[PDB]
Amino acid sequence: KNDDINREAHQLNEIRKKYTMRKSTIETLREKLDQLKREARKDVSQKIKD
Amino acid sequence: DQMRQELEQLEKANEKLREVNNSLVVSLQDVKNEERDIQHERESELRTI
Amino acid sequence: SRLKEIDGRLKSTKNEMRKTNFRMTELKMNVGKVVDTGILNSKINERK
Amino acid sequence: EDIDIKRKEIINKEGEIRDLISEIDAKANAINHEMRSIQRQAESKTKSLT
Numbered sequence: 231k232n233d234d235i236n237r238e239a240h241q242l243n244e245i246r247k248k249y250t251m252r253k254s255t256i257e258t259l260r261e262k263l264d265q266l267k268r269e270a271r272k273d274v275s276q277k278i279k280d
Numbered sequence: 281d282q283m284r285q286e287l288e289q290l291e292k293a294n295e296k297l298r299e300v301n302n303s304l305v306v307s308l309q310d311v312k313n314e315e316r317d318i319q320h321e322r323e324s325e326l327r328t329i
Numbered sequence: 330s331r332l333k334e335i336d337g338r339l340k341s342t343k344n345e346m347r348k349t350n351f352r353m354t355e356l357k358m359n360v361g362k363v364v365d366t367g368i369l370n371s372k373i374n375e376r377k
Numbered sequence: 378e379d380i381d382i383k384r385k386e387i388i389n390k391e392g393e394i395r396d397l398i399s400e401i402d403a404k405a406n407a408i409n410h411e412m413r414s415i416q417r418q419a420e421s422k423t424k425s426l427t
Contacts, residue, residue, distance in 0.1 A: 283352070283355070283356060283359065284356075286352060287352065287353060287356055290349045290352060290353075293345070293349075294346055294349055297342045297345060297346065300342070301339060301342055304335050304338070304339060307335065308332055308335055308336075311331065311332055312332075
Protein backbone atom coordinates (compact mmCIF):
# COMPACT_ATOMS: atom_id res chain seq x y z
CA LYS A 231 0.00 0.00 0.00
CA ASN A 232 2.88 2.37 0.75
CA ASP A 233 4.34 1.41 -2.63
CA ASP A 234 1.02 2.29 -4.29
CA ILE A 235 1.00 5.68 -2.54
CA ASN A 236 4.57 6.22 -3.74
CA ARG A 237 3.46 5.32 -7.27
CA GLU A 238 0.64 7.86 -7.02
CA ALA A 239 3.17 10.48 -5.90
CA HIS A 240 5.41 9.66 -8.87
CA GLN A 241 2.40 9.88 -11.20
CA LEU A 242 1.78 13.39 -9.86
CA ASN A 243 5.48 14.09 -10.44
CA GLU A 244 5.15 12.86 -14.03
CA ILE A 245 2.20 15.21 -14.45
CA ARG A 246 4.48 18.03 -13.26
CA LYS A 247 7.11 16.85 -15.75
CA LYS A 248 4.45 17.01 -18.48
CA TYR A 249 3.70 20.59 -17.40
CA THR A 250 7.38 21.55 -17.59
CA MET A 251 7.59 19.94 -21.02
CA ARG A 252 4.49 21.95 -21.97
CA LYS A 253 6.54 25.04 -21.12
CA SER A 254 9.31 23.61 -23.30
CA THR A 255 6.78 23.25 -26.13
CA ILE A 256 5.69 26.87 -25.77
CA GLU A 257 9.37 27.84 -25.94
CA THR A 258 9.58 25.86 -29.19
CA LEU A 259 6.46 27.73 -30.33
CA ARG A 260 8.10 31.07 -29.54
CA GLU A 261 11.25 30.18 -31.49
CA LYS A 262 9.16 28.94 -34.41
CA LEU A 263 7.30 32.25 -34.41
CA ASP A 264 10.65 34.07 -34.31
CA GLN A 265 11.91 32.19 -37.37
CA LEU A 266 8.62 32.68 -39.23
CA LYS A 267 8.64 36.42 -38.54
CA ARG A 268 12.26 36.70 -39.69
CA GLU A 269 11.63 34.82 -42.93
CA ALA A 270 8.39 36.76 -43.49
CA ARG A 271 10.06 40.16 -43.14
CA LYS A 272 12.94 39.01 -45.35
CA ASP A 273 10.67 37.73 -48.12
CA VAL A 274 8.36 40.76 -48.04
CA SER A 275 11.39 43.05 -48.25
CA GLN A 276 12.67 41.03 -51.21
CA LYS A 277 9.28 41.19 -52.94
CA ILE A 278 8.99 44.95 -52.38
CA LYS A 279 12.51 45.56 -53.71
CA ASP A 280 11.82 43.39 -56.77
CA ASP B 281 5.42 -4.22 -23.77
CA GLN B 282 7.72 -7.27 -23.68
CA MET B 283 8.21 -6.56 -19.99
CA ARG B 284 4.54 -6.56 -19.03
CA GLN B 285 4.22 -9.80 -20.99
CA GLU B 286 7.26 -11.11 -19.12
CA LEU B 287 5.76 -10.21 -15.74
CA GLU B 288 2.53 -12.02 -16.65
CA GLN B 289 4.30 -15.21 -17.74
CA LEU B 290 6.54 -14.82 -14.67
CA GLU B 291 3.54 -14.76 -12.34
CA LYS B 292 2.34 -17.93 -14.07
CA ALA B 293 5.76 -19.59 -13.75
CA ASN B 294 6.10 -18.44 -10.13
CA GLU B 295 2.82 -20.12 -9.21
CA LYS B 296 3.90 -23.25 -11.12
CA LEU B 297 7.27 -23.40 -9.37
CA ARG B 298 5.45 -22.88 -6.07
CA GLU B 299 3.31 -25.99 -6.59
CA VAL B 300 6.26 -28.04 -7.82
CA ASN B 301 8.33 -26.93 -4.80
CA ASN B 302 5.49 -27.97 -2.48
CA SER B 303 5.43 -31.37 -4.20
CA LEU B 304 9.22 -31.53 -3.85
CA VAL B 305 9.01 -30.82 -0.12
CA VAL B 306 6.37 -33.53 0.31
CA SER B 307 8.56 -35.98 -1.62
CA LEU B 308 11.61 -35.03 0.46
CA GLN B 309 9.84 -35.59 3.77
CA ASP B 310 8.47 -38.90 2.48
CA VAL B 311 12.01 -39.91 1.49
CA LYS B 312 13.40 -39.00 4.91
CA ASN B 313 10.55 -40.98 6.50
CA GLU B 314 11.63 -43.93 4.35
CA GLU B 315 15.20 -43.40 5.56
CA ARG B 316 14.19 -43.30 9.23
CA ASP B 317 12.07 -46.46 8.99
CA ILE B 318 14.82 -48.27 7.07
CA GLN B 319 17.39 -47.33 9.72
CA HIS B 320 14.97 -48.35 12.49
CA GLU B 321 14.51 -51.74 10.82
CA ARG B 322 18.30 -52.04 10.55
CA GLU B 323 18.61 -51.24 14.26
CA SER B 324 16.00 -53.91 15.04
CA GLU B 325 17.91 -56.45 12.94
CA LEU B 326 21.16 -55.51 14.70
CA ARG B 327 19.64 -55.82 18.17
CA THR B 328 18.04 -59.18 17.31
CA ILE B 329 21.27 -60.64 15.91
CA SER C 330 21.45 -38.42 -4.05
CA ARG C 331 17.84 -37.93 -5.14
CA LEU C 332 17.44 -35.49 -2.24
CA LYS C 333 20.56 -33.64 -3.40
CA GLU C 334 19.12 -33.40 -6.91
CA ILE C 335 15.79 -32.05 -5.64
CA ASP C 336 17.66 -29.56 -3.43
CA GLY C 337 19.62 -28.44 -6.49
CA ARG C 338 16.44 -27.87 -8.47
CA LEU C 339 15.08 -26.02 -5.43
CA LYS C 340 18.14 -23.78 -5.73
CA SER C 341 17.33 -23.33 -9.43
CA THR C 342 13.73 -22.37 -8.60
CA LYS C 343 14.95 -19.88 -5.98
CA ASN C 344 17.30 -18.35 -8.54
CA GLU C 345 14.40 -18.13 -10.99
CA MET C 346 12.12 -16.42 -8.46
CA ARG C 347 14.85 -13.98 -7.45
CA LYS C 348 15.37 -13.12 -11.14
CA THR C 349 11.62 -12.48 -11.32
CA ASN C 350 12.06 -10.16 -8.33
CA PHE C 351 14.83 -8.26 -10.15
CA ARG C 352 12.58 -8.01 -13.20
CA MET C 353 9.67 -6.54 -11.22
CA THR C 354 12.11 -4.08 -9.64
CA GLU C 355 12.98 -3.13 -13.21
CA LEU C 356 9.23 -2.98 -13.87
CA LYS C 357 8.58 -0.21 -11.40
CA MET C 358 11.85 1.45 -12.35
CA ASN C 359 10.42 1.89 -15.84
CA VAL C 360 7.05 2.81 -14.34
CA GLY C 361 8.75 5.84 -12.80
CA LYS C 362 10.28 7.41 -15.91
CA VAL C 363 9.63 10.62 -17.82
CA VAL C 364 7.66 10.41 -21.07
CA ASP C 365 8.29 12.86 -23.92
CA THR C 366 5.21 12.32 -26.11
CA GLY C 367 3.86 15.83 -25.49
CA ILE C 368 5.90 17.28 -28.34
CA LEU C 369 4.77 14.36 -30.51
CA ASN C 370 1.07 14.92 -29.77
CA SER C 371 1.31 18.70 -30.18
CA LYS C 372 3.18 18.28 -33.47
CA ILE C 373 0.59 15.78 -34.72
CA ASN C 374 -2.16 18.27 -33.88
CA GLU C 375 -0.23 21.00 -35.71
CA ARG C 376 0.13 18.76 -38.77
CA LYS C 377 -3.58 17.91 -38.68
CA GLU D 378 15.65 10.35 -3.83
CA ASP D 379 12.07 9.06 -3.93
CA ILE D 380 13.20 6.60 -6.61
CA ASP D 381 15.89 5.34 -4.23
CA ILE D 382 13.26 5.18 -1.48
CA LYS D 383 11.04 2.89 -3.53
CA ARG D 384 14.11 0.84 -4.52
CA LYS D 385 15.03 0.24 -0.88
CA GLU D 386 11.38 -0.52 -0.15
CA ILE D 387 11.27 -3.16 -2.90
CA ILE D 388 14.57 -4.79 -1.90
CA ASN D 389 13.29 -5.00 1.67
CA LYS D 390 9.89 -6.31 0.52
CA GLU D 391 11.51 -9.08 -1.53
CA GLY D 392 13.64 -9.84 1.52
CA GLU D 393 10.58 -10.42 3.69
CA ILE D 394 8.96 -12.31 0.80
CA ARG D 395 11.80 -14.83 0.57
CA ASP D 396 12.14 -15.05 4.36
CA LEU D 397 8.40 -15.71 4.69
CA ILE D 398 8.61 -18.35 1.95
CA SER D 399 11.40 -20.10 3.87
CA GLU D 400 9.45 -19.85 7.13
CA ILE D 401 6.24 -21.24 5.64
CA ASP D 402 8.18 -24.09 4.03
CA ALA D 403 9.71 -24.88 7.43
CA LYS D 404 6.28 -24.76 9.08
CA ALA D 405 4.87 -27.01 6.35
CA ASN D 406 7.62 -29.51 7.15
CA ALA D 407 6.77 -29.16 10.84
CA ILE D 408 3.04 -29.70 10.28
CA ASN D 409 3.78 -32.73 8.11
CA HIS D 410 5.91 -34.14 10.92
CA GLU D 411 3.09 -33.39 13.36
CA MET D 412 0.46 -35.12 11.23
CA ARG D 413 2.60 -38.22 10.67
CA SER D 414 3.32 -38.36 14.41
CA ILE D 415 -0.34 -37.95 15.38
CA GLN D 416 -1.48 -40.60 12.91
CA ARG D 417 1.18 -43.06 14.09
CA GLN D 418 0.35 -42.58 17.77
CA ALA D 419 -3.38 -42.68 17.03
CA GLU D 420 -2.88 -46.01 15.26
CA SER D 421 -0.91 -47.29 18.25
CA LYS D 422 -3.68 -46.20 20.63
CA THR D 423 -6.30 -47.90 18.46
CA LYS D 424 -4.22 -51.09 18.48
CA SER D 425 -3.94 -50.91 22.27
CA LEU D 426 -7.61 -50.16 23.01
CA THR D 427 -9.14 -52.29 20.24
